[PDB]
């Protein structure tokens, strides 16, 4: 699809992935948790989620997400450690930093995460069997993911 | 470029008459309809309901259909129609129909300037 970020007087690095086989709600929260970070920080932070040293806070899709001790100062008490969404976002981040560090020779020490947009895509459609002869749906909820890197926001 | 002096224009209602309950449902459009239900509060006209349309709101017969600039409207599409509707006038200004191209609006506009006619969309397509 097309890009949702339209700025025209910044030097940016961009990458996207269309139709990602990962939960939409999990992946939205992972991208919103790294917004505004410098790209050194977000790369460490994402490796810590993999190792259960930090959490992803959940501000939008949280009914049934458990409260945990690792989320004390964030604004909420709820979070999780989505391992498959962190695998996707890390690889999309590296393309955008490569795209920027190669089009204009800017270091990772002045790059920041300044935009994101997650959108709902069209899923795989299977079926499950219910009692008394009935059939029901069993679908996936995939996503489109985009991520922009550039200079410190102000 | 100016009309003759007229009476002061009065509009008895300033807003539009909106269909009952069109703010609750997207499927119900704001165009006016007459309430016709047996229990309808809008039809009974209890206090605090929307106003109802009636011929008591009609405009003063001398100023009805008069644009804010003082002129009545004529809608034209060709240069031939420019001359026929404006032989006798000073009560109407003219309007170019939306489908007329940019090539031919130059011919209508310059011609109508000589006749001494106001056009109300003079500067549409540069």
């Amino acid at each position: 699809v097309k890009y949702a970020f339209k700025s025209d007087n910044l030097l940016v690095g961009k990458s996207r992935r269309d139709g990602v086989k990962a939960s939409f709600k999990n992946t939205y929260s992972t991208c919103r948790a790294i917004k505004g970070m410098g790209v050194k920080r977000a790369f460490a932070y994402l490796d810590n989620v993999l190792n259960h040293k930090e959490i992803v806070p959940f501000f939008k899709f949280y009914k049934g997400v458990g409260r945990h001790s690792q989320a004390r100062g964030s604004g909420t008490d709820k979070g999780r450690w989505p391992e498959k969404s962190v695998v996707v976002v890390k690889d999309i981040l590296k393309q955008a930093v490569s795209n920027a560090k190669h089009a204009h020779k800017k270091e990772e020490d002045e790059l920041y995460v300044i935009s994101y947009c997650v959108n709902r895509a069209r899923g795989r459609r299977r079926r499950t069997f219910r009692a008394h002869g009935r059939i029901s749906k069993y679908e996936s909820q995939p996503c489109h993911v985009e991520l922009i890197v550039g200079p410190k926001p102000l | 470029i100016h009309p003759l002096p007229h009476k002061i224009i009065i509009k008895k209602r300033k807003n539009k008459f909106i269909r009952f309950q069109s703010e609750r449902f997207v499927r119900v459009k704001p165009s006016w309809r007459k309430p016709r239900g047996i229990d309808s509060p809008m039809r009974h006209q209890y206090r605090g309901q929307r106003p109802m349309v009636s011929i008591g709101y009609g405009s003063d017969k001398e100023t009805r259909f008069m644009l804010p600039c003082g002129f009545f409207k004529h809608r034209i599409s060709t240069v031939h129609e420019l001359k026929t509707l404006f032989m006798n006038n000073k009560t109407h200004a003219a309007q170019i129909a939306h489908g007329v191209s940019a090539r031919s609006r130059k011919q209508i506009l310059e011609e109508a300037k000589k006749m001494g006619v106001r056009v109300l969309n003079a500067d549409a397509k540069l």
Partner: protein, 123 residues
């Protein structure tokens, strides 16, 4: 207030619109004038220029006193522009001197749609 700055005045209060328990007439304001307790001693403040300060612009709004209300010293007033509800309980000024504000103290229905049988000249 750079034109009413030095003008001494008698204090008043805007208590509410003219109303019944069913309806409310926002084009007339009810006003309490200090030292006026009787319907009879309302003659002295009758027909005089008053003003209220709208404390969003800081400018005044000008008006005049039209009728008495009740038996107890209340009056009716009409302002240049009808008042907003936020202004209730605020102070009103009754000027002791005269001020020529032209026609900036008169209500909007009387200024336009006042029916002088008059015309639009078109220069």
């Amino acid at each position: 207030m750079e034109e009413i700055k030095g003008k001494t005045f008698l204090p008043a209060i805007f208590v509410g619109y003219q109303r019944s328990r069913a309806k409310q007439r926002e084009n007339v304001a009810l006003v309490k004038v200090s030292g006026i307790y009787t319907r009879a001693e309302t003659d002295k403040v009758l027909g005089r220029l008053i003003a209220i300060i709208h404390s969003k612009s800081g400018k005044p709004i000008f008006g005049k006193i039209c009728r008495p209300h009740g038996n107890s010293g209340m009056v009716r007033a009409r302002f240049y522009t009808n008042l907003p509800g936020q202004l209730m309980g605020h102070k009103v000024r009754v000027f002791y001197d005269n001020i020529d504000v032209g026609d900036r103290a008169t209500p909007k229905y009387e200024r336009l749609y006042g029916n002088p049988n008059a015309t639009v000249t078109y220069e």
